[PDB]
């Protein structure tokens, strides 16, 4: 019952300071562009210990499913190969990615009828709300 607040189909609403944090991260030219557009829907469900995510968009598809605490690997929608963690901290699903010496974290909150992502590469943050589809 974990996290049946962030079940279901949500889809892109809004975002902020996305390119700055693609830059950040490595992202080129190209793939920051072509992201940038992308109103992806984000499909996430949980059967027994294990939550899948899902984002489809015009741009890529991508999927991870996962334990939480469990490290994973995972192929980012920019093509990095990272590793993952995800955890539960207060009601909040926090991802660190590593690569290459790099972390980023990824964060997933439920605030009103909204599910907020908040993207930190360093200094940078950005946020995309997704609501409902
Ligand atoms: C998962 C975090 C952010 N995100 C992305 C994404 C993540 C990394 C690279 C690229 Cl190109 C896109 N697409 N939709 C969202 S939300």
Not at 37 to 42: H, R, Y
Not at 44 to 50: A, L, Q
Not at 71 to 99: C, M, N, P, Y
């Amino acid at each position: 019952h974990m996290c049946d607040a962030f079940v279901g189909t949500w889809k892109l609403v809004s975002s902020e300071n996305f390119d700055d944090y693609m830059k950040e991260v490595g992202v080129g030219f190209a793939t920051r562009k072509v992201a940038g557009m992308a109103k992806p829907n984000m499909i996430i469900s949980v059967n027994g210990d294990v939550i899948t995510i899902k984002s489809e968009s015009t741009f890529k598809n991508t999927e991870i499913s996962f334990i939480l605490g469990q490290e994973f690997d995972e192929v980012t929608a920019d093509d990095r190969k990272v590793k993952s963690t995800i955890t539960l901290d207060g009601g909040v699903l926090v991802h660190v990615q590593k690569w290459d010496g790099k972390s980023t974290t990824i964060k997933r909150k439920r605030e009103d009828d909204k599910l907020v992502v908040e993207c930190v590469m360093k200094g940078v943050t950005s946020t995309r709300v997704y609501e409902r589809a």
